[model samples]
Every structure is written in structure tokens, then in C-alpha cells.
Target: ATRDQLNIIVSYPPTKQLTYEEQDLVWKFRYYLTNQEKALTKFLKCVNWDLPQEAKQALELLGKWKPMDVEDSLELLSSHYTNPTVRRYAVARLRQADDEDLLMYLLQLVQALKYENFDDIKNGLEPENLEQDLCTFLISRACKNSTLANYLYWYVIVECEDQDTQQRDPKTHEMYLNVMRRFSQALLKGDKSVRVMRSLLAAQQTFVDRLVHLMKAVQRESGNRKKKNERLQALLGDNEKMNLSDVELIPLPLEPQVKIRGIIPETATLFKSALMPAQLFFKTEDGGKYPVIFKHGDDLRQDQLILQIISLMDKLLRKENLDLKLTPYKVLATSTKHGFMQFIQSVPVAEVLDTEGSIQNFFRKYAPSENGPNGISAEVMDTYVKSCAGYCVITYILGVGDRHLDNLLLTKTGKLFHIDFGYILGRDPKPLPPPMKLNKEMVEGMGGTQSEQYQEFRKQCYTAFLHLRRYSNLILNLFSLMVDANIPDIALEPDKTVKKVQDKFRLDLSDEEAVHYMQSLIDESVHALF
Candidate 1:
């Protein structure tokens, strides 16, 4: 019985059901299973925290066991686990995380702070409590580094300033404010040049101050239809008649790599959209200019979450030896309703369709080659197929909704990426949305449905889908931690958020059957041809 039981435990899947007898066996031999991540899940399930003796023993065991990897440790903070000991252990494990890794997960880490027992930690229960340790870790790091401070300051301030949370969820907002107070006091007490830190904060204020001024000027001239058009052009310097010294130096919060010398008013055009997002160009210290889209009047946290996940998925794909040429452009939410997005120089597919007649024509116009396949360069065609397949699988899995031709953009060099993730995780506003978005224009870009390029696209889809499937647990764990983060779509169905993603993973099917399932999904998407 002993030998058979140990063998079964060693081979048990992390998600497999554990019988009462099996649970007891796992708990009894938990020490011997320290190194196995599969056993960590089983052992956690076997724990009976309600019982006094078992609770004490499990806490002690956690202290003695080898430290968990950062990813696994994050899982402990998910809604499934409420025991303070377990949560604290996870935070303690996170203490060893490097700065780069910590920054990547900083947004979620802030959300995870909400899951802690704030009252008990706020009191002097223990010097080494979860809240105290986490706050100190965050603040100490921010005190020394500019980048960390920039993000942590913005993230904490966004939550503190959330009007919805302030009015409806007063208790949570109070906690957010309290954390903000700590950060404020800590920075004041630090030895770093107070002037430098204050300027960093003031720089962002100056940027918004100018944007607000410009917005009002545009609105004030809205009455005269002819003059309004000229006024807009004059403010944006589209006429090239505006003076350069009129605009002030404005540092971008999105990228702190170099200080901004001045705003290039000539290129600062307003987007012809509902929110009227301002596209501004900043001249840098080294005589370089880059574009940023500054937007307000919308909750940017949802977009921020999707962008972070997209970057993480791209990184995971690279680790698996797959390069899909994803852009994963940077997004930073300064407040609950305002932020900036990196503006990649690209044309929307809708405009390309109107002018070029077809994607093949569009590519041929931009990247022509006399001897190339479909009269488009080989490199550009390959880039189109790879990025198309990459986004198809990712968008479908994430259930990103409200896709339109305008939101899908492609760069001149052949990179394609989807934008405006206002709907995600199956919260699409459209009626009867397809399982995936494989439009005719995209297929036409890759030669045709029957072409060799189309086949390569299909194969790449299967490969990316299967590779992401292997990291299902990591992805699921990340989502589980964000269930309480108040992202619009995620908050809509908090109870089923992670399950929605897990359902897409189709973990129950074997890998062999999984490939067939993916093929069917692609077929369905193509058949719909939307």
C-alpha cells in the first residue's frame, strides 16, 4: 500500500481529483513532495485548515519547505485560498523576485494587496505581517529607483482616485488612500533629492495642463464651422505657420528614458473619434521625436490589463522558441480615466481597404517585389502571415470583442496588431460574435485561402495555440489574481472570469485531440469569414 500510494502521488496531475484517502496520504507525506510542483497543488488541496492541529503543522511545514517559484507563489493569493498563513508565505516568496520581474507584475501586486487582511495587519499583530512587508518592499524599492516610483505612484494614485470605488466601495477606497498616504510619507522621509522626485510628478502635471488648455481652445472655436476647421489646423500647426517656442517642455510619463525638450506642436493632431484623443509628438534631448496618444474620460485599467497579458504571452512564446513578431506596445494608466498609449506608425486596415481594394494590393503598394510571391516581398508576406496567426489565436483565446476593420492596424514593415481591447473575456457587445476573427481581407493578404501562405498561417495558429496551452496554469493563475481588480469585463462576471479563460484552454483534451480542436476552430472562423 505504501509503495503503490507513493507512486500514484508522484504521477498525479495537478488538477486531478483527490479522494479522502488520497488527500490524507498527500498530507502525510507532504514533506517528501517538496520539490514537485505537481505535488504542491495536491498537498495544498489536502490541507484541512479548519482543524487546529493540521493548521499549525501546515504553517510550520510551509516555512521549512523549499521556496516556490514566483509564478506558483502568486497562485496562493488567488481567491481560492483565504488562510493568512498561505497568503503571507506567497508574499514572503515574492521577496526574492528581481526588480524586472517585480515591475512586470507590479500592477497585479497592487490588486493582490486588496486581498490581504488589512485590519489585522494594520494593527500591531506581528512585525512581519503581509501588509507591512509588502508595503515596505514596494516603498523601499520605489525610493531608490525612478522607474519603479513612476509606476507605483501612478498605480496607487489611480486606485485612490477611482470615483466609482470612492462613492460605492468606500471601505476599499479608504484602504487605497491609506496606502497612498504611506507612499507619500515614505518619499518625504527618504534621502533622495526631494526636488528631483517632485519634478517628475510636476512634469506629468505640466503635460496635462497644456492638453487641457488646447482642448478648451478647440471647443471655444466650435461655433464657426469654417473658422473652427482653420482653428484646429492652426493649433495642430498643420499649416506650418505656428511658432516653435510657443510650446513648453513636456516629459512623457509613458517613456522616461530621456527628458523631453519640447512638444512638436506641428504634429499634435486630434483624432477624429468620440473621445477626440490627442496624438502628440515629443522632441527628445537627442533630437529625436516619438508619438503618444493621450486619452481621457475612459477607464484605462482594462486596456492596461490586456496589454500586460499580451506582453506576457509574447515573452512566453519566445521562451518556447516561437517568434510571432508581436508589438505589445506600451500602455500606462495615469489615473482611473486617463492614460497614454504608444503610437506605432501604422495604417488601419479599414483605410487600406478603401484605398488599395485588397490587402494583397496594399502590401504590393508598400512592399513591392517583381519576383516575390503574389507580387509582394517575401519578408513582408512572411511577417503578415506570422503576425496574423499570432493575433488570431490570442484574440480568440482572450475573447477580445468589438473587433472592427479600423481597430486592426498594420505597419509598413509588415507587423499587425489589434488595438482597443474594450471588450475581453467573452464580454463582447456585438450579437452572435464568431469564435475567432479571421476576416477575408486578412486571408487575402496571405495570397488566398488555397495558397501555400495560407497553409503556413494555419500551421502557425496550431503551433502558437498548443504552445500557450502548456502554460495554461500560469495564465489561469494570473487571471485568478485579477478577478477582484475591477476591470470592466472581468468584474462583470467575477466568479467565472478565470473559468472563461480555462475553458478556452480546453485542458481536458489530450494534445493530439487539441490540435484537431484548434483546426476546427480555424475552419469555423474561416467559414464565417467575418
Candidate 2:
């Protein structure tokens, strides 16, 4: 009665702005409010949902105020908003919302768009701010869904349409179009494929064609390194050895040809730079493409093996509940050079960083330009920051070296992670490197140091660093067990490799103190951007 009374008393006429569906949704929503006194009941009393400004004011109430179920809430948004005609936004959100509860909250938060905007005719005080923690929590659980991820991008199927995408720079326009074109064939349409190590299991003739052969040949003739060393103490004398055994050997130099399978005639395009080893993209039976990096010279076996350990570390981190999504792809060593494995699909950071206009062109922008997509939304931006902060902590703890802008890659959706394990275990090629290597381009990508995104970055990094410390024993002992095979940085040390890692754990420090120490590294790294 109070609500109806206010509607009649108001001077403005009733709303004709909302469509049939909008009008129906508004009524059900109003009934939901009057049926049970929700937090929004008082605010909607005098305002009309038809009023554009009133609608805006009401929508802000939902920032952190989800009071409904996802099923119903999702219905509140019927895949389109009334405002835009050039393109209909996909409206899929909650990038990491993989669970039931999280999805519910996601819907509730989004459904609040049914809420309106504008200053109150029944104003009592200031409207509430959206809760930051709610948004931060949802993002971590939301990013894994590709279906959800795909829904976020835009399109212009109709030619000559005056759309935002067509209005952008040529390259930006092409990228948007190409990704969507490739997405359905690769994943969105439920197409499937496999990776190597796993990819070696031959079932199809075509898949068999993709496999390469590996054979181990022995040089037992005379004056061979194997014939010379045989053990660590070979540098000393014949019998001197701490203990190491040569791995198995099989027939090599097959008569005529050592027959390795696969066609490598058309080398896959190099999308990014490579310092060591070689890379090419190979296709699976169904036309799925993945990188197959050939390991050979300049510590070939070492780099491949280090990445294996890195993958192990990433797996353990995910199990420990840190969605730290480090990009650790697979590698193989067939005769220390033959085995080819998958690497992450990536482009140069310079593609995103060093633009023709300005370095400032990349980070922290929120509007669509003649240049590019409105940059990713803050939800997506924080997704990158969370991973950035994750790697910043993980790399530091693991003594990851070669930290630079060029090697850090951002996924098309929104993830930031490092590549190249050539330097690690407290070693770096640079003189007097900053403690953890957070750069300005990076901090800016994180929406600047004082931004809400940056705060989340710092918080996540602090939390990840502390958690990694708890598992310090497992990580250290693995290095201890391998002796050197596991240690990618293979020289100039004793058991001290693990010891350096232990020092990073700072096991003696209290949690607050450990976090504070990491906080110091980030504080320093942020300004040290070269």
C-alpha cells in the first residue's frame, strides 16, 4: 500500500519506456520485494523503473547486494539490455564461478540490474557502495569457464554496420574477428584434441604421422665422454664416484634411416621470440594446433627438465587452493633433443605493451576507442592481476630468473604468467636486479598501485607467498632428490640450491612478518620497472 500510494502521488506520468519483457520482469521483481521485505524495498517506493536515471540509481544497489537465486536472477537479464543496438553484449560474467554457490551469487549480483538508478524522492541518506570483497572472491572462481569466457567478446556479422568493433583500429578489429572465428572450431563447439607425452599414444594413422622417433646410441668405442666420466668423480680419476648411473640405451642408427614419424615440412609460424631451443606448431588429427618446442643445444635437456618441475609446482599450487595459473607447458627429451612437446600459445608482450601511440595506451583505460576494444573490464583486469601477483610470488620463491616484460604473456581472455626458466635459483643475468621484477607496465596493467585491482594484486601475492612457504619442504626436497636434473640452474652450488629456497620460505618468520616482507618486495618492484 505504501508503494502504490507513492506511485500515484508522484507528479510524473507512468512509464512507457520499458518493453513487454522488461515490464513483466519489473512486476515480478516488485512482487518479490513486496512479498518479502528485501533491502531494496524502501528505495524503489517513489521511483519509476521507466525513468532512465532512476533505473541507474537502483542498479548500483546490486554491486554487492545479491538477494536472489541464480536461475531466477539469470532470467532477469534475457541476454540483452534495452540500451544498445549496434551489438548485443554476451553478458556472461563470473569468469571463475565454477561452483553452485558462487554461480548463485554471480546471478544475484548481475540480476540487480533489475534495480533502478537516480537520487531518491524518498532520500534518507547516501546509497551504499558495492562490496569489493564479493567481486574479488567471485573472479577467482569464475575464469575457468570458456563458455562464459566466450560470451564476453563482441561481434559484427552484419557488414557496414556502424558498430564499435568496426570503428576500432584495423589490427584490433582483425584480432577480435579472428579469435571468434577460431574459437568455435577449437573449443566453443565442443571440439576436442590431445597434447604430447599424452599425444604419443597412437590410434589414428594421421596421429601416427604426427609422432617422431627417438633412439639412443652408445659411443663405447674409445675416448667417449660416457667412457670417460661415468660418474661425478670422473674429473678426478677412474674409480672416483659419488654415484650416478647411465640411463637405458636402445638400438640407434637404424639401417638407412632412424625412422621418426611426422611431417615437419611446414614449420609453424613463430608468434613470439625464442632465445634457446626451437619451436613450431603441429596439428593433431582433428586440426587442433599446439607448440612442439625442439630441445637440442645450450642446455637443451636442462630447460626441458626445469619446465617439468615448474609444471609440478603449478599443479601443487592449484591443489593448495591458489588459482595462481602459472603457464607451465609440457616438454620431452628424446635422445636429449628429439622429444617434442607442447608449449603455451602466446604472442609478444610488445604486441600489447609497446604500441604505436603510447605505452599508456595499453593499461588502465576503460573506454572503447578508435584504437581498440575498451580494454578489458576491471573484472578481467583483476583476473590478470591475481595471476600476475601469483607468478610474482611463485617466481620469487622458486628463485625464477630472467624476469622481464618480454617473457610475460597475457592470454586472450585475461591471465598473466611468465615463461623461460633459463635462469633461476637466486641467479640472474642482470646486475643488481630488483627483488621480484614488478614493472611499471605491469603495475599499470594492475590499474596502478593504489587501484582496487592493485590492492587485490598485493593481497593475493601476500597470501600466495605465505601458502607456498607452508609447502616449502615438498618443493625443497624435490630439488634435493634430483640433485641436479631437477635443478634447472645446474652449476656453481652444493645442496645450497635447496638452501636458497629455504631461505625464501623464511619459515622462522611469523605469518604477518612473512607477508610484510613480501609486501616490501612488491613495493620495491613496482617502482623498479625498467
Candidate 3:
């Protein structure tokens, strides 16, 4: 193939698999292609595996393959199948990511091990070398940090004990158990003996145990608010009955930097729902109180994934100087069965609607207007518009479903955030969700659709959408990597997961056209009869 042929072919989407001719063209000029960062994925895909000579050449080229961005590494791992060499290359690049950054993608990386070629494992086939390399990297880092160790331990433990994973993919289950066993050995390898590591793990278990005990106690004291508080305090205060001693130094999953000082028994209230999620306020060393909702019997991994993306998106937006005041609250999926969510001090949109007629009224009530636009404080209105646009763009791009009044919460300062991501990837339990979740109430809160505030909201929406579209590929790659993850919504249609998200980005549309397209979608949502 000529230079022109190679140039034209390299322009093809990275997600697309090349035809044999195309593959040959890329393979032939792969040496020249080394400088092109985007071409790496394509080059890897072009390797003609059937020919041992071709495979050998490809492996040789990969040995000195161009350094890749963390995103590129993730994409390789995201693929349904990857050459062991290429997968190892990805993990090598991932090493460049800092502890916090690695933690962000940790869940997916653990899941990515499933792609390790262990096809003949039923015949006692040893794991691929890359599998141990990946696990080794994880273990090395996790051992250095207690928070990392705690999360990694549980992440593997949950999968190891998962009945579904055990029944469906026994080999993968064995792989998880193997990693767990390796980590346990590592923890016990140092100055600490098995007893020491056990004590540390047992220390971690105490928090969960106390949480479960508190929830059970709350359930037992159920009659009325006054008696519930009184009995709950008595039950919580009795050291022998409840083991309610103050924890001196325990890292909180909500934010690892903050350690728990003690639990505020007065704030140990439970929601009267079927799951009965308990909200426990913890006094921290920073002279601050942090509340977390602990729940059992529900798979929180899906919510964890959505919130992680939201946090990442918030960062991406901030990088672009587009601060939308989006609240990407903390969520940690400790296990398949239960986890914790950072409790934010906010009132639901439904509560706002019941107390005040509109979101504007709610804002006006808390932040009184004084020479401000539309009888609302200027900062309040600005926050309201920006945050509304942020969540609208976020929920729309993510295809977050089940958008109702109750799950949409607004802080007194006017930050709007959506919670309860039970449905995502456009899988709404209710029929015909709008492209975005804007309703008459939300539009009314912007001082009506025709008002200046409403127009600003539209502008912000357009801006946020265009900005997020720039990172569409990164977002898409992240989702593709999680396709095989055990999250409920993703597991429902693993094959279509990435494409479903891809469709939301409207990647083919030009920026000029996307604004109009976004406008049309917004119009449809605003006028949605349902």
C-alpha cells in the first residue's frame, strides 16, 4: 500500500476492525505508524495472528510500541480480546497513573482480568503470565496503602463469593479467589503475621458489623420519632449491648483522608423504606461531621459506576473551565450485596415542590432576593441555571433513566444533583423518557422557558453538551471497558452497552449542528406531555 492508502486508512475510527487488506496495509507500515498515538489500537488490531511470522513481527513491534496515554491503555484492556503482550503493555502504561487515578479505574481493571486467555482452564491450564503481572501491580500498590488494601480486598472478596459469578464462569471465580489468596499472602508476608492481617481485616469488618447492628436496632425501635430516638440512644450507648466505643483512627470510605472519631448516636436515623437505609453521622478529626447511608440487600455497583463517571465528568468539566456545580457524591461498593453512599445535605425536588411551588421559590425562600434578577439572588439564580444544565447534560449523555422528582436533590446553595442510578444506558422502567429529564417544573424554575434565565440555561446546556462531546471517546472507552462488569444494568445487555452510550454522544454531528440537535432534544423534553 502507498502512503496515500495508509493515510486514508488510519483515518478510520479506532473502534472499527480493519478488513484484511486494511489490516495488511497498517501492518506493512506499522513502523511508520508508531508515531501516531491513535493508530496504536489500529496497529494492534492489524496484527495477523493466524500467521506465526506475522504474530512474531507484531510482538516485536509491540516491544518498543510508542508510549501510550492511560486512556489508550484502558481502551486495549476494554476490548473483548487482547493479545497478552498488548494487554501487558496496557497495564504497564497504567502504572504511570497515581494512586488516586488508579483507584478510579480499579474496579474495571480487576474485571479486565476476565479477558486473560484462560480458555482451557478446565484442563488445568496455567494462567497467562500477564494475569499475574496485572495482579502483581495491583497488589504492590495496594499493600502500601491501607485504603487501597481495604477496597481491593473487598472488591476481590465480593467476586470470589458471588454465586452468580461462581455458577456462570467458574474459572473467573477461581481467578478472583486466586488473586484474593495472593493478596492475603502478601499482607501476611511482612513483619505482620497472619494474625496481624486478620486483625486488620477484622478491624475493617467491625465498621460493617456496627452498621448492621445499628440498622437492626433502628428496625427494632420503630414506633415513633421520639421513642425511636430515645430507645436508639439507649441501645447505642450501652457498650456491652452495642460496642459503641469511639473509634480513634479508622479511615472512612467516604473520603479516605478523613478518619472516623465517633458515631453521633442522635443522628442514627433510618429511612422508613423497604431497604431501610440507615444514615449515620460520623464525627471526624477535622472537626466536621460526615454522614453516610449504609444499605444491605441491594447491588450498589451500578450506582458506584455512575457516580464515578459523574466525578470524572466533573473533573473533565472543571479542566475545560466549565464549572457546572455538579455534585458527584461519593459512593463505595464494598460488596455485591451492599455499600455506602455519602449523604449530602439537600432537599429533594419533590420536597421542594411540596413546600414551595417551584425551584425558583425554593431558592427565593432560602436565598432571599435583594436587588437580584427575578426576585432571586443573582448567585442563587446563576447556580440554579449552571447546575441544572450540568445535570441535564450529564444525565442525558449517560442515558441515566428513572428521572423522577424524588431522586433529584438540590442543596440550599442551589447545586442540583441526581441520585439513585438504578437505571442507566436508556433503560428506563417507565416508558418514553425524554432525551433529557427537563420537565415543566424545572423550566418554570428558570423563570419560565421564555425568560432570560431560561435562555442562559439553554446556553449553558449547549456549552456543557459541546464540551462533554469533546471527551466522548474517553467516556465511550470507559464504558466499553466496563461492559463485562457485573453491574446490573450493564450485565443486562453487555453487547449493546457501549453502542447504546455511543449513540447518546451523536459523534457524527458537527459542533455547529450538535447545538441545534441538542436544542431540538431540549425542546422535545420541555414539551414532553408525559
Best TM-score goes to which candidate?
3
lDDT for predicted candidate 2 compared with the true structure? 0.44
lDDT (C-alpha) at residue 287 in model 1: 79
Ranking by TM-score: 3, 1, 2
> What is the lDDT of every predicted structure here?
0.77, 0.44, 0.77
RMSD of each: 4.1, 23.9, 3.5
Model 2 lDDT tens row, 297-367: 23344554466556655666777877765677654343322344466665446667665222234433422
**TM-score per candidate, chains pooled:** 0.88, 0.47, 0.90
lDDT of 1 by residue, 97-154 (tens): 8777777778887877677665643442222245544666677677777777778877
lDDT of 3 by residue, 1-530 (tens): 39887776765544545789888878778889787766777787776667788778887877666776786678777654456677777778888888877877777777776776544222222321244356777877887776677678767777786889999988889888777777776776755433364456666567767766765676677576556656666666665667653765566765666677767776676676678676778788787888888887788888988998999888888989999888999987666777889999999999999999788888888888878877788897899899999999899888898888999898888788899999999889888667788877788887887789878998999998998888776777788778888888888998888888777778778899999998998887877744
Count of clashing residue pairs in every prediction: 0, 19, 0
Clashing pairs in 3: none
How much is 294 displaced in model 2, in angstroms?
2.4
RMSD (CA, angstroms), candidate 2? 23.9
- Two-way TM-score contest, 1 vs 3, winner: 3
